[PDB]
Symmetry: none
């Protein structure tokens, strides 16, 4: 199962890697020469013992130290080169994975974000994309280098004492099965301790975060005894974790030791020790010893690699997720702003009570309409629907054509959102007022935008004034100032359809007559949809609609609904 | 001086277990000795086994190797188990100590530091200390035994070559020094992605996909460059070090050529001498880096002694109250958060007559929440006096005082356990499951509990991954209801009001607030208008108050405040 899953996942990833195939190829050749350094250095023992102590000083003297120094230079160079090439390929593929995930997540449905913590996604894309590369790199390096060295060593063993090698080979399958069984018995118990440590973490974190309810409700004994239990289980699982390998390693090298001691017990018998010499035994047996590390490394590569692909899969699924549905094909430059809800009903995902039902309303160009009604109702939902954050279930919302006929980009350039909870990207004030159009709007343009939004009183108080850096997640700006900055954005862009949210707005602003003048100047021109909560806007609004339980129950003018004096006057009395 | 004083402050926690350390130490000694005895055997094999003596190649070697390997494996297993046992015991003792102590600290301690930082103190630092110190001990003993076991063999089998190597060791040391000396962007990646996911709403309108894509491009590529840089630096270091060592060894071998030397050497003598020289390269590497790891361990440990030496909140109150159906009163209370010098609360006087619900409204940042924080004595005041039943809150022992208050807030933490057990938190045995279940429906929390797979015995699993914002709130109400606490503190600033079933929560509050003292940081219109007294807070002071004939018109701020929300 999992070999197949991991291999299809890998064939998915190879497109991302193939552009850096040159780096891969180079690293591989360097690894080959690296393994040959070691092979050719172990060969150097034969001429040393036989000739250099068969009465010849030239060997030990002139060249042997020279060749060793040169081989070590070669080893170091192959080492550094392979290291660098692999680290380069990995850096590239990791960064590529990350740009893919970022670009994709940016284009996801809003439902995807309100539901998931920003963190989990952020953490996964930084950690997993690095792990895929680490595991893949290690696996490749192992196969190449150590599979080259086992070849070198097997051939050398066969040239020097063709006989002894086969005794090792015939022993190989049963030794392999023995080692594999011993390995599978004990060492495969990381997740046990991962669970237990997750419990340690959970207890500690619940106590630290919920410190205040522990204090009020007096659960110190409960939390304590709980930690006493889980920490001891964590201890015991750490000890079982070590015991696994403490038991499995000596056993395994003992098995290999038996195989080698049999080979050596044949070294004493006459048929083969006659042809051979004291220098050949040395190189052959040292080859066999050297082989133990490559064999160990190679028989764990599937573990390493399948792990890498198991993380690559969690990245791939995020990529496979469905992005925002966008099939408009219609584009509009500077819409007029004639927005009409016809028979709109809509229920948020997962819920079972519609946030809106049979909603019918009409907003003509250049004029405003206030959505007042019991807090918690669907006026906010109405606002959210015009931007296609959520697709209605039944009916149709028209802009001049159904919103879903329009490209999301074109549809969204028509809409300007002014609320207190606007996001302040950490950057200059000017670049926050001209978020994604720094190239299109002049400095004087931005200056006048901020002036007309009655924001310059608190900008001129900044450190560098208008070029001061707001952000750092918005500490430097209060809400009454965030509103005016949002208003500056909207004035600059001069979008044809405004969505104004005074719900979250703070009317407790030392400067709110200025916020009111900014709004008056903002909405002179264009269609406006206010989730109203101010005396000023409901005073000047062209139409007031009263919403409860996702239904429009009364429509009319302020004065006409007070002459009427029905539900609107009930709200008037209440607020 | 500090690096060792910290270890001696720590040694008391370890000394109960020195019994394992010494056993591990002997095992390490014998392990080094086994590895040395095999290099010893190297000479008999060659010389004797091919001084025309199959006696050695059949008898000596095949069985002595197996014996030595058995001993090696057992010494390894034993030292492993001993060190692991002691290390587990100390990390357990220390994690338990830190959990208890941190829990006993005041809220002033938690405001400064992140919760995740304090969690790291328990999960990692406490393990890193024992890790680094265990590794220090093992390196010291094991490799300090191997180094001498090898040096002896070296000088014995050929004093000539060995002194030649020793005379070179100083220069080699200085050289490896000079090169091992030559041995933010991640924050920008996490930030560039996090403030994208934050402003996804603002990125979709204004069309900020392009500018964000290229911002990321920049940041990601910059960290890729940094990440390659570090590995390149690390990579080059060791090749050069191996080259240096190999130079010295090649010179030694050029020396073995001279006839005065070679004559002493045999096929086996030189073999084992150079074998031990090479083996010595890993003891030396380990023995030069050991004090660095001890340093980092003891630094992590003095971090935790900084935590342990901090003081737990003060509970000198010797007064107990079984239960207090009584009023809480603020008498000219003034407060300033430690570290700030502008009082969050100036001269304040506030009465919450028993049974009555006093709803206090105030601007989001104001000291309205500070009041409810003061009643439970999360912080002590600077001037004034808070009386519960006409006696200073500080007169009481904190346990009794907090038994009288129940907190209800959306963000109330739900601890990984059964729904039922969360409702009877810290008093699971006291209340019968009938009491619990009644408390559950009385809070309208049952509408969603039976939907759960095991209902009331379903466990909130994986740090609270199951429940909704609005569900936690009804569970908190159930907890306070069941406990039936005289003083109700109801936090509605964190409430998250827009929910699927808010009428349920509202009626739950209706039931809870009734015939019970309630002090609510109110945002809801309903809990406000049907409250006994409304109290406005502006900055550190109270501006104006009002009942039901005054709720009609307030002199101060209430008009605009009510108009905003
Ligand atoms: C003799 C001999 O072989 O010398 C050879 C000469 C050949 C003739 C040279 C070697 O050097 C190379 C060897 N391979 C060759 O082809 C030549 C290789 O062999 C490893 C063996 O391990 C056993 O452990 P034990 O001592 O038995 O416990 C020892 N016993 C045997 O082999 C018995 C056998 O019967 C022979 C034995 O030593 C000995 O005792 C020798 C002694 O027995 C001989 C006497 C009998 C020897 O050391 O070591 C790597 C270095 O490994 C990295 C690396 O660069 O790959 C991997 C890294 O692995 C770990 C780790 O072990 O710490 C894994 C951990 O899980 C992890 O926590 C950490 C890290 O994550 C922490 O952050 O790294 C670590 O080893 C590191 C070290 O430098 C210091 O960390 O280097 C060297 O590669 P190279 O640099 O490319 O050449
Ligand atoms: C020692 C060893 C490990 C290592 C596992 C670990 O260290 O965890 C892993 C896989 C192996 C597969 C075959 C095998 O066959 C023996 C006959 C053999 C060969 Cl073919 C060559 C040289 C030898 F020395 C031996 Cl003994 C030994 C193996
Ligand atoms: C190889 C090595 C490391 C390791 C550094 C690293 O790996 O980072 C660290 C410190 C050293 C100090 C002296 C030294 O002297 C050489 C001549 C020597 C001796 Cl005295 C004994 C046996 C030998 F095999 C060698 Cl070569 C070598 C050292």
């Amino acid at each position: 199962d999992k070999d197949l899953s991991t291999w299809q996942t890998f064939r998915r990833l190879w497109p991302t890697i193939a552009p850096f195939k040159a780096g891969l190829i180079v690293a591989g050749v360097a690894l080959i020469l690296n393994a040959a350094s070691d092979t050719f250095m172990l060969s150097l023992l034969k001429p040393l013992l036989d000739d250099g102590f068969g009465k010849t000083d030239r060997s030990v003297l002139v060249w042997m130290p020279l060749v060793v120094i040169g081989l070590m230079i070669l080893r170091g160079i192959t080492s550094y080169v392979s290291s660098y090439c692999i680290s380069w390929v990995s850096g590239k593929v990791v960064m590529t994975m990350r740009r893919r995930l970022f670009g994709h997540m940016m284009g996801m449905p809003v439902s995807f974000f309100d539901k998931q913590s920003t963190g989990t996604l952020l953490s996964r894309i930084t950690y997993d994309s690095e792990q895929v590369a680490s595991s893949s790199s290690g696996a490749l390096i192992t196969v190449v280098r150590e599979g080259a060295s086992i070849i070198g060593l097997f051939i050398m063993m066969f040239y020097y004492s063709w006989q002894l090698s086969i005794i090792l080979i015939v022993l190989a399958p049963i030794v392999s099965i023995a080692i594999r069984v011993v390995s599978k018995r004990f060492r495969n118990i990381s997740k046990n301790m991962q669970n237990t440590m997750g419990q340690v973490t959970t207890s500690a974190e619940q106590m630290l975060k919920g410190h205040k309810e522990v204090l009020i409700f007096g659960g110190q004994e409960v939390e304590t005894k709980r930690f006493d239990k889980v920490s001891n289980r964590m201890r015991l699982q750490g000890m079982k974790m070590v015991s696994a390998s403490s038991i499995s390693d000596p056993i395994i090298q003992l098995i290999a030791s038996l195989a080698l001691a049999f080979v050596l017990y044949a070294a004493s018998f006459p048929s083969v020790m006659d042809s051979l010499t004291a220098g050949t035994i040395t190189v052959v047996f040292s080859s066999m010893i050297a082989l133990m590390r490559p064999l160990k490394s190679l028989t764990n590569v599937n573990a390493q690699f399948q792990r890498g692909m198991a993380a690559c899969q969690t990245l791939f699924t995020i990529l496979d997720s469905e992005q925002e549905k966008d099939e408009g094909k219609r584009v509009i430059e500077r819409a007029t702003g004639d927005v009409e809800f016809r028979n709109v009903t809509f229920t948020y995902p997962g819920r079972d009570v519609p946030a809106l039902r049979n909603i019918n309303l009409k907003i003509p160009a250049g004029k405003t309409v206030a959505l007042v009604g019991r807090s918690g109702s669907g006026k906010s939902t109405i606002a959210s629907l015009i931007t296609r954050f959520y697709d209605i279930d039944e009916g149709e919302i028209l802009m001049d054509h159904d919103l879903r006929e329009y490209t999301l980009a074109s549809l969204r350039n028509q809409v300007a959102l002014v609320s207190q909870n606007v996001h302040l990207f950490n950057d200059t004030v000017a670049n926050n007022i001209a978020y994604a159009r720094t190239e299109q709007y002049s400095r004087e343009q931005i200056e006048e935008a901020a002036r007309m939004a009655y924001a310059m009183d608190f900008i001129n108080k900044m450190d560098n004034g208008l070029d001061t850096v707001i952000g750092e997640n918005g500490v430097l700006l209060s809400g009454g100032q965030r509103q005016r900055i949002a208003i500056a954005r909207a004035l600059l862009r001069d979008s044809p359809i405004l969505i104004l949210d005074e719900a979250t707005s703070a009317l407790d602003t030392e400067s709110e007559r200025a916020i009111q003048a900014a709004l008056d100047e903002l909405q002179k021109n264009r269609t406006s949809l206010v989730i109203a909560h101010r005396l000023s806007t409901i005073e000047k609004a062209d139409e007031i609609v009263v919403v409860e339980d996702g239904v429009i129950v009364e429509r009319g003018t302020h004065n006409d609904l007070l002459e009427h004096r029905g539900v609107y006057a009930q709200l008037h009395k209440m607020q």
